[PDB]
Amino acid sequence: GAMAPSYRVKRMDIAKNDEECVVNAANPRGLPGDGVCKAVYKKWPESFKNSATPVGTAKTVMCGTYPVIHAVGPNFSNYTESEGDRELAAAYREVAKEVTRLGVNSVAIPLLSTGVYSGGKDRLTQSLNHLFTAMDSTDADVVIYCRDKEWEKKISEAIQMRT
């Protein structure tokens, strides 16, 4: 475990992370995709061997010894708000299980279902709160990755609010 488990936020490419493993915002079919997923495919293409997994699940595939946790959030274009919220919570619970199983001291995570799976809504708070519910019982250092300058400020404020 980390000596003093923390949350941090960085505004940069998750493919340049400084953590012991990465969470991919994957599609259910293990396809290269777009957004975070395309960056992950360019950096760790070997990790997409048999990476297909259902919505609300996570599947880890090694790239060398570096673990890529493929986590499949719901596309809110297809799910109801209610069923989508359940699947988004479940995907992050499966990420916490994988992070624990791997024995890593740190993990790079993106906010699931906030990009092309958001159904055109702002889901920063919804996705971040489900990340916290899952990851609070783990002792890995968590580093959240984002692209937008206003999202960086809001995520940082939410981390700081809990202290």
Ligand X SMILES: CNc1cnc2ccccc2n1
13 binds ligand X (CB under 6 A): yes
- 115 labelled binding-site residue: yes
Contact range with ligand X by CB under 6 A, out of 10-18, 75-83, 135-143, 153-161:
10-18
For residues 7 and 28, give the distance between their C-alpha atoms in angstroms, rounded to a whole number.
27
146 binds ligand X (CB under 6 A): yes
User: Which of ligand X, Cl ion, none sits in contact with 10, Cβ below 5 to 8 A by type?
Assistant: none
Position among 93, 97, 147, 154 found at the interface with ligand X (CB under 6 A): 147
Q: What string of H, E and C letters represents the secondary structure of 76-138? A: CCCCCHHHHHHHHHHHHHHHHHHHHHHCCCEEEEECCCCCCCCCCCCCHHHHHHHHHHHHCCC
Is beta strand 66-71 parallel, antiparallel or unpaired with respect to 58-63? Answer: antiparallel
For residues 54 and 74, give the distance between their C-alpha atoms in angstroms, rounded to a whole number.
10
**Whose Cβ is closer to ligand X: residue 15's or residue 52's?**
15
| Residue among 59, 71, 28, 22 at smallest CA distance from 43 | 22
CB 104 within 8 A of CB 140: yes
- 13 labelled binding-site residue: yes
Position among 35, 83, 93, 152 found at the interface with ligand X (CB under 6 A): 35
User: Which of Cl ion, ligand X, none sits in contact with 117, Cβ below 5 to 8 A by type?
Assistant: Cl ion
Minimum CB–partner distance for residue 42 and ligand X (Å): 9
Residues that bind Cl ion (CB under 5 A): 12-13, 115, 117, 146-148, 151
